[PDB]
């Protein structure tokens, strides 16, 4: 078996071990939808409470993406600067992509605290525009019906991007990126799924949505700080300073 077929297997394994929620569970729970009364309960919570809940869920989701990154071939052999540069730019882009698995395009609901709810669940945050953009992005991804293996390979490429500003060893990230691009393209060809390539988000789209998202989280963090046990302190200290 080729280096490339082994790379496909390694990335798909890493994803399976760090996917946080099982696709099977997410699909089964689609019928489990918040009642009008439960939605009203969430809308009546203080911004501060909804922020504490959402901030903690987002931090947990980031930590699954850090673990995913640490299991990708070559990631740990990059200099720490480059690990931080990739995860700082990339980890929340991966969370936003991972969301499409927990999103039902039929009723525009997301899996949140054990049931599916629409974007009005989050009314107390005062972020309707930004949250609507996040729901829209998941909506556009859901049309692809990504396989588990496609999302493993795609989210590896979201992270391993030699064009991120600030890399010391751009050559080394280029080498890992070329191999992951070949693995993704190789797997799509083998599974007759090259049709998704033209349907993938235009680039800049994920970067600019993620930029806006993180900007808002940094404002909330500045006004009402949460603390977590840092999975990757050098990275954590670059956002939670
Ligand atoms: O456990 C850790 O080591 C760790 C855990 C999380 C991050 C990380 N948080 N983050 C946020 O945007 C964030 C979140 Cl999710 C919750 C509350 C406040 C914030 C904010 F202050 F940064 F804005 C990120 C964005 C992009 C990339 C990595 C991260 C980094 C490291
Ligand atoms: C802008 C702002 C202040 C808040 C954003 C509100 C809202 C859009 C956030 C809060 C919790 C997030 C989920 C948390 C965990 C997961 C699991 C992951 O495996 C996939 C992603 C997912 C489902 C997150 C999706 C985005 C959520 C709902």
UniProtKB/Swiss-Prot annotation:
A molecular-function term among this protein's GO annotations: zinc ion binding
Superkingdom of the source species: Eukaryota
Tissue spec. comment: Isoform 1 is widely expressed in many tissues, including liver and adipose, and highly expressed in skeletal muscle. Isoform 2 is primarily expressed in immature thymocytes.
Induction: Up-regulated in the state of obesity.
Subunit structure: Interacts (via AF-2 motif) with the coactivator NCOA2 (via LXXLL motif). Interacts with the corepressor NCOR1. Interacts with CRY1. Interacts (via AF-2 motif) with the coactivators NCOA1 and PPARGC1A (via LXXLL motif). Interacts (via AF-2 motif) with PROX1. Interacts with FOXP3. Interacts with NR0B2.
Function, in words: Nuclear receptor that binds DNA as a monomer to ROR response elements (RORE) containing a single core motif half-site 5'-AGGTCA-3' preceded by a short A-T-rich sequence. Key regulator of cellular differentiation, immunity, peripheral circadian rhythm as well as lipid, steroid, xenobiotics and glucose metabolism. Considered to have intrinsic transcriptional activity, have some natural ligands like oxysterols that act as agonists (25-hydroxycholesterol) or inverse agonists (7-oxygenated sterols), enhancing or repressing the transcriptional activity, respectively.
Name of the protein in question: Nuclear receptor ROR-gamma
Keywords carried by this UniProt record: Activator, Biological rhythms, Developmental protein, Disease variant, DNA-binding, Metal-binding, Nucleus, Receptor, Transcription, Transcription regulation, Zinc, Zinc-finger
Lineage: Eukaryota, Metazoa, Chordata, Craniata, Vertebrata
Family: Belongs to the nuclear hormone receptor family. NR1 subfamily.
Residue window of the full protein shown: 267 to 507 of 518
